[PDB]
Design a protein around this ligand. Structure first.
Ligand SMILES: C[C@H](N)[C@]12C[C@H]3C[C@H](C[C@H](C3)C1)C2
Ligand SMILES: C[C@H](N)[C@]12C[C@H]3C[C@H](C[C@H](C3)C1)C2
Ligand SMILES: [Cl-]
Lengths: 23, 24, 23, 24
């Protein structure tokens, strides 16, 4: 489903952004 | 087709939106 | 899949805890 | 069981672990 695929991409992006914000 | 996965998908998108706004 | 169920629950819990942290 | 969903599930669990630890 596009919703689950989009949320999966966004979840991976969120971790990337959060790690970068903390560092 | 799982309502929990659908709900958690919406919530995950909302979480990123809220977190970006909080940081900016 | 128990993994996707668990990540769904953890994702919901994560948003709740983070909102309460921000408040 | 899509590899993308499996990876994002693992990453979402890791994200909660890391975030709790950081806030502590
Ligand atoms: C990262 C999200 N908690 C989420 C949880 C579930 C696994 C994937 C896709 C969506 C459902 C959203 C990641
Ligand atoms: C809230 C919930 C968890 C425990 C502490 C620190 C952060 C994670 C925020 C209080
Ligand atoms: Cl934060």
């Amino acid at each position: 489903d596009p919703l689950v695929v989009a949320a999966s991409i966004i979840g991976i992006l969120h971790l990337i952004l959060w790690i970068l914000d903390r560092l």
